[PDB]
Symmetry: D2
Subunit: 171 residues, 4 copies
């Protein structure tokens, strides 16, 4: 038997423990087109049709964006774009209204409600019109059989849509 004294400089009293953390993935699409028909006399949308190129997704991260295009997500080879088609605008007042339309994600279609909030209807620098408005609503991955392989535990069933639009008059 013999007696020792730790050399504290090269000794290490250590532990490891696993925990979970919840976080929001935020992201946009860099490339989309839309058609916007709006009557400032009555503050009613007449036609709103959007097409979004799935390929142009951006969640501030290279390898996750790529991964979004694969079979377990968007299948962008087979279904290159997602689309929104307004079917009904129900006015609340001049600042607010309830938009119903058809969303299509990878060829599956469902009718959704978005909350229209008019941010401000003006006549621009040049005397030609502008508008600023937002569309907000929650959709369920499950309603579109989207990412069915990924559990509703790992990644939430709810997707929050925030569409913020500024827009100018035509011709």
């Amino acid at each position: 038997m013999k007696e020792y004294t730790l050399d504290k400089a090269h000794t290490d009293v250590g532990f490891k423990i696993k925990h979970l953390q919840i976080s929001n993935v935020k992201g946009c699409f860099k490339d989309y087109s839309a058609v916007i028909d709006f009557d400032p006399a009555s503050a009613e949308f007449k036609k709103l049709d959007v097409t979004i190129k799935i390929a142009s997704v951006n969640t501030e991260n290279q390898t996750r964006d790529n991964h979004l295009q694969q079979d377990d997500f968007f299948k962008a080879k087979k279904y290159p774009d997602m689309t929104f088609t307004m079917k009904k605008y129900e006015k609340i007042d001049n600042e607010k209204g309830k938009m119903t339309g058809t969303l299509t994600i990878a060829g599956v279609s469902k009718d959704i409600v978005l909350d229209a909030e008019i941010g401000g209807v003006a006549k621009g620098k040049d005397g030609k019109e502008k508008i600023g408005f937002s569309l907000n609503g929650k959709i369920k991955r499950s309603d579109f059989k989207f990412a069915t392989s990924t559990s509703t535990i790992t990644l939430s069933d709810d997707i929050n849509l925030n569409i913020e639009v500024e827009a100018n008059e035509k011709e």
Copy 2:
């Protein structure tokens, strides 16, 4: 009715989705004492007794370290230190053995097994002894009624102990 064209520079087609991520919290204790009795003729530990100052915890983060000291964790005001007491060393060979001892965390005591691996028994620069060895094992938060408020979902029930020791002879 009127027609508009998005100004893409001040338009934003966006989404938010919540996901979980699993991660390891790694950490040591900066301040501890020990008593080490070891026989290099037979590669057997004779006595090993450790005291660790809960206060000296370090998980590379200021606010979590503080939080560790509160009631939902260590209760460091009432129970300032955790202790380990060897009761039995069962030799496997000269490099390996099974250590049984009493761990006490916030006044609750349980007997644990650590896996002793001898990293190397030498005579130093000056002809006085050194040893290098490690102690490894898993303990359960639940066995010590530790952090009982925190679910075994958020933070894992299993804690992995890695004690890495270098140490020199005495007097």
Copy 3:
């Protein structure tokens, strides 16, 4: 050395593995009062005020219901009831409208929107009025600093309100 043959009847080749499962807690309150003012000529709510006795909660389970009353939840000793007060009814059509009001849970108050759907406005068996309607909306635990100790991982931040009402005319 010697050779053996398993007795398969008293041998057992076994394993244990931990998994997570997500589930909905559904529940009502058995005891509440309300005041309901409604104009069938215009299908508009005029006043809607509800008080709910936290004590009367029922989620088909004895020990969880009790647990709901404690500090980590409702604090029913100090705050025996939750209340809803309509501030605005914005009509969509005769079947649909957007209700804004003040919800108070354990003394914290926030303004919420419920989705009013009129299930049917009739004159009853006796020639005195009836109505059937529903109120639906999502509120956030976090907006009411509710159950702050419980993580948004274990128990979801979102609570879904489904109020289904049948109701008869007065005096």
Copy 4:
């Protein structure tokens, strides 16, 4: 305007909230073979070789058992059996020892340690030998690239092996 009184018998003040729950999946294999060589004079295992038919899995549930056989798990069509091969038995005392061996799951092989505990070495009713012993240890899904599609969040990375054996002498 008009006044109403809830009919409480057909009114319902309700809510839904999502929570997580952790649970152990326990299970065995109904069909396996083994070869057991053991020396009661020295209480040492000499050879232990096990083959388990993946097909014979039982976790008290029909549809999960089927699901275990598919690509995201066992791939039982391609890899019908898992195997264990002892390489080393290191004796602790007569009741305890450390077993090292090769586990193969769907064609991937890793060396594991099991904790041998001898439950009792006897001579049976007829004067021919019996033994009762257990093998216990934790293996990591990740070490065997097992169920790689399933996250370590949903289903734990750690699998706990409990092998309980009774066994009689040969010829």
